[PDB]
Amino acid sequence: SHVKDILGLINAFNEVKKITVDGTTPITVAHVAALARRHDVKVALEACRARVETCSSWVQRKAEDGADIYGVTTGFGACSSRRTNRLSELQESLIRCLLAGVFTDELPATATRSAMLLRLNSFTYGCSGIRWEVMEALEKLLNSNVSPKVPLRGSVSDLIPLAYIAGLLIGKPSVIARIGDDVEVPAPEALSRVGLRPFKLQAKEGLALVNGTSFATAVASTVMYDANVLLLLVETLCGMFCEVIFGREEFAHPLIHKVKPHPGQIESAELLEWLLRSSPFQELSREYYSIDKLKKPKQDRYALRSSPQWLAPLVQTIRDATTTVETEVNSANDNPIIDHANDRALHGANFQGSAVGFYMDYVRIAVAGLGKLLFAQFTELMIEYYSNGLPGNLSLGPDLSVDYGLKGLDIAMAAYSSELQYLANPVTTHVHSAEQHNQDINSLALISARKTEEALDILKLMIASHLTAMCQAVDLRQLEEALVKVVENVVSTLADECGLPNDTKARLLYVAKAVPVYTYLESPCDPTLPLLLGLKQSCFDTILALHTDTLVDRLAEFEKRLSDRLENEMTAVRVLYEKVRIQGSKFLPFYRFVREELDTGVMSARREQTPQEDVQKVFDAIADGRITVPLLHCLQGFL
Amino acid sequence: SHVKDILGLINAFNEVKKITVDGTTPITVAHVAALARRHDVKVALEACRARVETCSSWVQRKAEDGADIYGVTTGFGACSSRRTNRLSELQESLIRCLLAGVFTELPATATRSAMLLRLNSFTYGCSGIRWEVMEALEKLLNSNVSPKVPLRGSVSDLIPLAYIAGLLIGKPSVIARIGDDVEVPAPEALSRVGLRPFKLQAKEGLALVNGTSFATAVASTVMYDANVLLLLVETLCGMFCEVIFGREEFAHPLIHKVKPHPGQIESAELLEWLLRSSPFQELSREYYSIDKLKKPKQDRYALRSSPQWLAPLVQTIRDATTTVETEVNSANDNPIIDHANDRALHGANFQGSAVGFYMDYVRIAVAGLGKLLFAQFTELMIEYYSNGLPGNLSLGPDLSVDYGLKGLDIAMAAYSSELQYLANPVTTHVHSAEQHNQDINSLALISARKTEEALDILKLMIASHLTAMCQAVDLRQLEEALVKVVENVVSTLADECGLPNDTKARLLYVAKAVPVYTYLESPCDPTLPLLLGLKQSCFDTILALTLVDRLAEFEKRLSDRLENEMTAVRVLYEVRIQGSKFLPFYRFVREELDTGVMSARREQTPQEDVQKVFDAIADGRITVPLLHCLQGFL
Amino acid sequence: SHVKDILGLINAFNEVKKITVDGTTPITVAHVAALARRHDVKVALEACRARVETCSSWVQRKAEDGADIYGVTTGFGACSSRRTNRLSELQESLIRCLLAGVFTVDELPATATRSAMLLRLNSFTYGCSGIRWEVMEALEKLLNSNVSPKVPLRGSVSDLIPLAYIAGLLIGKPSVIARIGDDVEVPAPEALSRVGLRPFKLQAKEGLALVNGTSFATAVASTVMYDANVLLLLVETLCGMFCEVIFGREEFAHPLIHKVKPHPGQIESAELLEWLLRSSPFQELSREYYSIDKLKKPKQDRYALRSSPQWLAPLVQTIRDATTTVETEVNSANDNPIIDHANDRALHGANFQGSAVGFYMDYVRIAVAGLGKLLFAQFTELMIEYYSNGLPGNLSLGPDLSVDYGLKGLDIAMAAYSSELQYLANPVTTHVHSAEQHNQDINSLALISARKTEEALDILKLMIASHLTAMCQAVDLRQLEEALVKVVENVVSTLADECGLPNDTKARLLYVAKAVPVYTYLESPCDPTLPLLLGLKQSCFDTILALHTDTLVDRLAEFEKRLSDRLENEMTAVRVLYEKVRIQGSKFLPFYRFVREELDTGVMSARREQTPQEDVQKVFDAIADGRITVPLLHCLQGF
Numbered sequence A: 001s002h003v004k005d006i007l008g009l010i011n012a013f014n015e016v017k018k019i020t021v022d023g024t025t026p027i028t029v030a031h032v033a034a035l036a037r038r039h040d041v042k043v044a045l046e047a048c049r050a051r052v053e054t055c056s057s058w059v060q061r062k063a064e065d066g067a068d069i070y071g072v073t074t075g076f077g078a079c080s081s082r083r084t085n086r087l088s089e090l091q092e093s094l095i096r097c098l099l100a101g102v103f104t105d106e107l108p109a110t111a112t113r114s115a116m117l118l119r120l121n122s123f124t125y126g127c128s129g130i131r132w133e134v135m136e137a138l139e140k141l142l143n144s145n146v147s148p149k150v151p152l153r154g155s156v157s158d159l160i161p162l163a164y165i166a167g168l169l170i171g172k173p174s175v176i177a178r179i180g181d182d183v184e185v186p187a188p189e190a191l192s193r194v195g196l197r198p199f200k201l202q203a204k205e206g207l208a209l210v211n212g213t214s215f216a217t218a219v220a221s222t223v224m225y226d227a228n229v230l231l232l233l234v235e236t237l238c239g240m241f242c243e244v245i246f247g248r249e250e251f252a253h254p255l256i257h258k259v260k261p262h263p264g265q266i267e268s269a270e271l272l273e274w275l276l277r278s279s280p281f282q283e284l285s286r287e288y289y290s291i292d293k294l295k296k297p298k299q300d301r302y303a304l305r306s307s308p309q310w311l312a313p314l315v316q317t318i319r320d321a322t323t324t325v326e327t328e329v330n331s332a333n334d335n336p337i338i339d340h341a342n343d344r345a346l347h348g349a350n351f352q353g354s355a356v357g358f359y360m361d362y363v364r365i366a367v368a369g370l371g372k373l374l375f376a377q378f379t380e381l382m383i384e385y386y387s388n389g390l391p392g393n394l395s396l397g398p399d400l401s402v403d404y405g406l407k408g409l410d411i412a413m414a415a416y417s418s419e420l421q422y423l424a425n426p427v428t429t430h431v432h433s434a435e436q437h438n439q440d441i442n443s444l445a446l447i448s449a450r451k452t453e454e455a456l457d458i459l460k461l462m463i464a465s466h467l468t469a470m471c472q473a474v475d476l477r478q479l480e481e482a483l484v485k486v487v488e489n490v491v492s493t494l495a496d497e498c499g500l501p502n503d504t505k506a507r508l509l510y511v512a513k514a515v516p517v518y519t520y521l522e523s524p525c526d527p528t529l530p531l532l533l534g535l536k537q538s539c540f541d542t543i544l545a546l547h548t549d550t551l552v553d554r555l556a557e558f559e560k561r562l563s564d565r566l567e568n569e570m571t572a573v574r575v576l577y578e579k580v581r582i583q584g585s586k587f588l589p590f591y592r593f594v595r596e597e598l599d600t601g602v603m604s605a606r607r608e609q610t611p612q613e614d615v616q617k618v619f620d621a622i623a624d625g626r627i628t629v630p631l632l633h634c635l636q637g638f639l
Numbered sequence B: 001s002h003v004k005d006i007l008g009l010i011n012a013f014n015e016v017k018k019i020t021v022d023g024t025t026p027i028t029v030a031h032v033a034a035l036a037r038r039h040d041v042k043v044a045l046e047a048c049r050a051r052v053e054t055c056s057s058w059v060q061r062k063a064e065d066g067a068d069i070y071g072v073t074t075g076f077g078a079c080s081s082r083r084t085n086r087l088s089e090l091q092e093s094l095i096r097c098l099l100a101g102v103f104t105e106l107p108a109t110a111t112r113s114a115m116l117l118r119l120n121s122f123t124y125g126c127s128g129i130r131w132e133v134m135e136a137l138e139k140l141l142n143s144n145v146s147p148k149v150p151l152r153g154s155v156s157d158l159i160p161l162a163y164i165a166g167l168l169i170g171k172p173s174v175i176a177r178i179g180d181d182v183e184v185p186a187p188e189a190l191s192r193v194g195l196r197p198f199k200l201q202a203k204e205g206l207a208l209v210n211g212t213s214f215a216t217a218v219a220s221t222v223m224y225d226a227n228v229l230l231l232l233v234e235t236l237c238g239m240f241c242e243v244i245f246g247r248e249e250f251a252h253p254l255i256h257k258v259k260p261h262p263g264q265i266e267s268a269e270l271l272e273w274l275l276r277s278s279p280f281q282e283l284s285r286e287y288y289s290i291d292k293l294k295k296p297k298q299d300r301y302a303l304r305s306s307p308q309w310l311a312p313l314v315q316t317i318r319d320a321t322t323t324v325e326t327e328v329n330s331a332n333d334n335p336i337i338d339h340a341n342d343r344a345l346h347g348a349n350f351q352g353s354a355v356g357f358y359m360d361y362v363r364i365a366v367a368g369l370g371k372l373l374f375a376q377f378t379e380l381m382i383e384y385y386s387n388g389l390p391g392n393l394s395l396g397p398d399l400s401v402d403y404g405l406k407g408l409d410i411a412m413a414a415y416s417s418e419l420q421y422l423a424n425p426v427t428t429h430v431h432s433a434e435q436h437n438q439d440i441n442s443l444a445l446i447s448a449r450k451t452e453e454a455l456d457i458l459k460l461m462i463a464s465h466l467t468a469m470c471q472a473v474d475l476r477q478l479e480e481a482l483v484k485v486v487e488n489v490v491s492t493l494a495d496e497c498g499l500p501n502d503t504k505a506r507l508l509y510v511a512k513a514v515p516v517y518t519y520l521e522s523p524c525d526p527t528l529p530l531l532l533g534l535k536q537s538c539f540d541t542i543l544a545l546t547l548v549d550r551l552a553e554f555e556k557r558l559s560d561r562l563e564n565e566m567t568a569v570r571v572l573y574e575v576r577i578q579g580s581k582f583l584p585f586y587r588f589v590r591e592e593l594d595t596g597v598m599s600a601r602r603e604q605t606p607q608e609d610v611q612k613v614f615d616a617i618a619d620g621r622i623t624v625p626l627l628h629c630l631q632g633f634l
Numbered sequence C: 001s002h003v004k005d006i007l008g009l010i011n012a013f014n015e016v017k018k019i020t021v022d023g024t025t026p027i028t029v030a031h032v033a034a035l036a037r038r039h040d041v042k043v044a045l046e047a048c049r050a051r052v053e054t055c056s057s058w059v060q061r062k063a064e065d066g067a068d069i070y071g072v073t074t075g076f077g078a079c080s081s082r083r084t085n086r087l088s089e090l091q092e093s094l095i096r097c098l099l100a101g102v103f104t105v106d107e108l109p110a111t112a113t114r115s116a117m118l119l120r121l122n123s124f125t126y127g128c129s130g131i132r133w134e135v136m137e138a139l140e141k142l143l144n145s146n147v148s149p150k151v152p153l154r155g156s157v158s159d160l161i162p163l164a165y166i167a168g169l170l171i172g173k174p175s176v177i178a179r180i181g182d183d184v185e186v187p188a189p190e191a192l193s194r195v196g197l198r199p200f201k202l203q204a205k206e207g208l209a210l211v212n213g214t215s216f217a218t219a220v221a222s223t224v225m226y227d228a229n230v231l232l233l234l235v236e237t238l239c240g241m242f243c244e245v246i247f248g249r250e251e252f253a254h255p256l257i258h259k260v261k262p263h264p265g266q267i268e269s270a271e272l273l274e275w276l277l278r279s280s281p282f283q284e285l286s287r288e289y290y291s292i293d294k295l296k297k298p299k300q301d302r303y304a305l306r307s308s309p310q311w312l313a314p315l316v317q318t319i320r321d322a323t324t325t326v327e328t329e330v331n332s333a334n335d336n337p338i339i340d341h342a343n344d345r346a347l348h349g350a351n352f353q354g355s356a357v358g359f360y361m362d363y364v365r366i367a368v369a370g371l372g373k374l375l376f377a378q379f380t381e382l383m384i385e386y387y388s389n390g391l392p393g394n395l396s397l398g399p400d401l402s403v404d405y406g407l408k409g410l411d412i413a414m415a416a417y418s419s420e421l422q423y424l425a426n427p428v429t430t431h432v433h434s435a436e437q438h439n440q441d442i443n444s445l446a447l448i449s450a451r452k453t454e455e456a457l458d459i460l461k462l463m464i465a466s467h468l469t470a471m472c473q474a475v476d477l478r479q480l481e482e483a484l485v486k487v488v489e490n491v492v493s494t495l496a497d498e499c500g501l502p503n504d505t506k507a508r509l510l511y512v513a514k515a516v517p518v519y520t521y522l523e524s525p526c527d528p529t530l531p532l533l534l535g536l537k538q539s540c541f542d543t544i545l546a547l548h549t550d551t552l553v554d555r556l557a558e559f560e561k562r563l564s565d566r567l568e569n570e571m572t573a574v575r576v577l578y579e580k581v582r583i584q585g586s587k588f589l590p591f592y593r594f595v596r597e598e599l600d601t602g603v604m605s606a607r608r609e610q611t612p613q614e615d616v617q618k619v620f621d622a623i624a625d626g627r628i629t630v631p632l633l634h635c636l637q638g639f
Ligand SMILES: *N[C@@H](c1ccccc1)C(F)(F)C(=O)O
Pocket: A071, A076, A077, A078, A159, A211, A335, A336, A348, A351, A435
């Protein structure tokens, strides 16, 4: 299952200490994300050294002998006609040319350090002709938290942004470098602060430094790591959605999916069946539909019932794109490719980031699809007509005139989904004929990756809101159960006290179980609201069925005492709740994490924290990966 | 002409000191942009006080009498069937509910603009907000105090506007800036400016949030920038004509009279004027008179089709400006209080659809502007299309270690590519929102943000284009001086070697005809075009007529003398622009910004040079050379 | 008001008999549309003949004398360096090379081809082109004889290739096929033969003059803009009909709301709507509806109605502004070079660039998507009982709703229509390729854009047809509703008397009869679990308590039993009778009367044999062929 794969990714992200780069051990997207986000993670370049020196020595030797080789004894790009024996100055001129970005905004340090690792990895294959020593310098800069400041834009995929890494290595004074989060110094000073001296570029070295896909793939790696975690988070929370909305778990039955066997359909449903088996909320759901069965929907709306079919292509896109991105991480993306064993330089296009670009477009569409699912679920949850007993906007009230609940989060979810759908148009359809028409196809992979990343930022917001709304719903469902029991108690005991016959008592107790408590919580004894309406109906029917002056007297008394006692008793239990079925739920880790670890409570006019303050905490734990602890606790035992 | 209107906008932006907000005087996109960007610009709220207090008094009194008015004695949005007499509590619960954004922010410029636009809406006397709240808004604006507001959450501007209301009522969770250096909770910010937290009266929560102030705020600075960058692009089309050796006839008035799209006539009229007595157009005429029948009859589209192309772009940007200003000067609020007729009117003036739709159109027009720049830049970089200029505008002379503006060229493709992507519409992604109450919504703030991102890219593209054109000016000027040397060296050496008149004429024609940048790298290289032509001539002069000895001696003396004298004038160089209308631009970039001709001998990177030009564009210093260049156009 | 302008367009389209083509009288989008769609409409070329002949002889002389002029003594496009004295062969070679379309048949329709021939003929009258007058006469004759070349759909970046087929017809190319009327296709030489024409031999500049125009893009844009104006006015108008059926509050259109936010399209649409709804018999019912249980019902309408003027504003402005732009292009010399024979120069420019039309086509497609979304939102409210203020879900008459799903099929199709429409509204203009050996490094793509906007308008017609059909259903449901409520009242009133109930009981019961939405219990009026008997039971119990006996209870039980006997019979009778009025006082009467009487339809139900397709097809056909303008004009009479 993809579920097990994603769990392995989260484990690797958490547990990796050294990233070994040796030209043989694969670097995964978890490794890239770990390097970028966890400062205790170090790069260990293992001495493929012989292969590198061999390649490097071949290049220098051949260049000096006057061999004809692109970008070493030849001009660059559309200028490959121009030959030269000015080996170093040819390389320096390229870097000077490519230091051509503008600060408007920058590629963040996380992406720049990731790009550095990716470039370093490419070099390990022994095809590039770069000096081993430059590789050691990359390792040292990576482990010392040194990275150049890089302009956001200018790559069609990543000459310009990689030129800043080359600019660092040769100590260009105009190249500003970061050391940790605050220090910014010129490149020479930065090299000095970490025990390095500027390099003088040898044959092919300028080009080797710049002629890769390191930036597009760096962003695509963290994008894919996040896509995997958030995918699993959304699949998992579909079960939590089912629990609070009173869904029918049958939607995830294995025969339905065996019979329409998209791998992502089978796998998501398998997860969901397991999550909802033995659920105490599904137990309540079954109870709910047994009361007035033929007045209630036979099936759920699509946002739940159709989730495994919806998720299927989304699962598959995110999983296949991960593979594609990792193939690029672990490639010699460079040109020429030096085939030193066979004494030749091979002329190709390994710098072309098209596999990443196209998959970035696809993933952005899948992410939009995840957002739409979240939006549809959130929309059902806010509307009384579709929420099977829950109050509109998940407003606790009881005074709804001064409690609009999660209406602000509802509006925001629409704004999120809308921008997310816009973002999901492709970048790859906008290929311009570039660089004196030499680059007449180009991948735009970094631009695409950047947009998929922005889409995932919005998805995090939507997940944060959704999970916050669902924790509200858990509290509302547990309070609902407790309040219905109080109503039943009060109605039952007042029926006894008033000497009402069994017929009357049976009718009144049915109304107490049947009518949704949130339709009358605001004013429980309001003769205009559903509880008294149902009770008055039953009282007329009891009179007719039993048909007298004694009975009417007693029913009038039952009503006076209900008016005296019921509201206080409902207030007592709600005030107590404010100051249990989730305990048997597989989503307990999520609820406990949000309520206890993050320190939140049921949202109402009495809790002084704003919706912002609640959702911000949940968002921050999604953003910084702490959300994976309750996720992993929730899924332990599965397969 | 729109050119006058845009110059009027630039002047207003530069000259405004006080923005009077009085319920009658229009606020323009220049006023808004000036407030946002110039800290010395102050708001002056003019005591329209009478109509504010009447409206305010009417709302509170009716609400206390128990009149049934939406959002004053009723629930909000889809909850409008719930009635209540809890007047202040109703308003407070709205703000609480709307403090629902997340920091993953809208900038201070946008926030202050939103504050001004809300204050402006209130002056029309339809909102029922207290005058005192308006005074607090004016004081907050002049004191540089602004709430920190989350970027996202509006479908257009409830959530972002709730942070301004949060500040005004002293919500502890709301953080305010005081200048650029201070951040404090809202109550502390109010304290430091001598204000007390407000207690919301009837309709006051809703009045503060029920506007289009953030969408319209971002759209105002978007439109100011779009006008200025539009004029800049149109103007620079003329500089492009000059450096590329274009034919100015493309801007002839009859061509456009006969296809009279207003943007087409007006842009062409500007271009005709810019190029009228051009020294560079004089060179262009000289260039095409040499081997006339081996050279293009017409320019390629990026120049020749520029007025036709600019036409819808001018018109879209002009029309969108009108629309945005109408919104700036509107009572965007609901209910609308018609106190003169004793009624509250229920409608949808909070709906930012005029702004949203026009934001979609302008982003498409900005993409069209970027495409034009990209096409022009591409031509400039390719020797086949640049009429004598070297590839990548590389000075060399050693082209093997000078790749010129190739970096900038690649970047231009990246800029255009992302720009074209951005220009898809936001307005087609309408979701049925807020318990299906908001089943149409404008998404205007989101659209405005994307158009703003598009303009950021356009600024990058303009900075690059202008920088290349300055490079190209230097290269055209060097070219003229180099050709004169070649001619002089050829002429004097022909004399010394005592060659016949037949010979001297053939060689001097070659010296005038072959483009100098084809052979600058190695002037006497026998495989390069100068000596190729010279050898052709020498064979022809032999067929047409010792003579051989005098020709071989010529070729040896040229081989010794020429490159040295070419290097001399080049090194000296390291003028026609003095007579050009684009002199202010060249002088601005070269002298004021302190730059020079780009080459391997210049230590400054392309980044360093383009950054200065970009910064001047971003901060509006570029309008000085722009206004000088346009001086006298009417 | 734009309303006056559009009514003007419609009048002109219906009334024009001859389109005068004279070089100074403007051709409007209505004239183009009338030529394309009404075959009795004729072209009249008015002998401008002088300046034309001056121009063509000027060009011929200059060319013969060897003057250097692009495309006359010069190669084309990127080949303009090449000179030639081969005047006719040059023009012949252009046409041969431009005959390069492929039939996939998909083709530009005859309507667009004939419109394009008109527009080319028009450009020529300005006397800048150098075409012979006799070629112009030939074009007039082909137009008046209904002869058109068959033109491949694609190939233009805007209209060399498509226009080459008109040129191919004129010179008698055997490979060019021509239509004569609707039933005949013959090769070009035979088509010319049949209308008394001989093949032309191209003179200097004539091949180029024929092909170097924006004729096809502008032809499709003209009929697009004509349709966009009509459909816009229709949508605006039908917003008023929506208010009437949905029980809206006409206040949303009050002139002060819009004076205070004065976007011209906002004021003008609201002005129309205020007028349409003033003194409305349906608005009278709406006012009564909200006066009953006032405080249980929404204070404001949802956005699809109340925000319609604000939504329409930019849509109106875009469509009106694009009409001007397109008409400026229709009335232009789109050709190059432009011959200024007065001053003996050929001016070299780019009037063939269709950018003005291209960019506006993109804007209008966006505006049309906005119109679709407005209809989709309104339609959605109408289908949902929770938002329709008493109307049954899906506008199902029933009464047995288990076998009548009403307009659910139309509801589903409306989502399918809107979805594709929103997709179409992405820009074409952002996809500029550097074309024609990099000569055309900007190009408008106007024809491609115009085609997409036309497709968008096809879908909008479908949506309007559905929306109008639904609102006529709703009219019937509202009128039946009023009749049914009066019967319930009468039966309850008289039965209360006859059962000897007290006056306070009678009054309580009559309140229930007035207040309960009849469509909530029509299925089974005396079902004890449905809202009528629910309210009656509550009222009966309250009566017993208030007057608190055995006689009262007997009479109340009798009342319930007898209502159970009579009410359904009476309700069935008035419904059956209705299937066998306030619309008569409504400004929308001509729409209802057009759809019901002239198109021969009825209330939709399980008893009507016609499918929704059959009903919507008729309305769609009427929208497509302009018959819908008849009730539009009647409705708007006096505005
Ligand atoms: N990636 C291309 C290039 C273009 C300009 C400067 C450096 C590199 C290339 F295709 F030419 C290549 O390096 O192979």
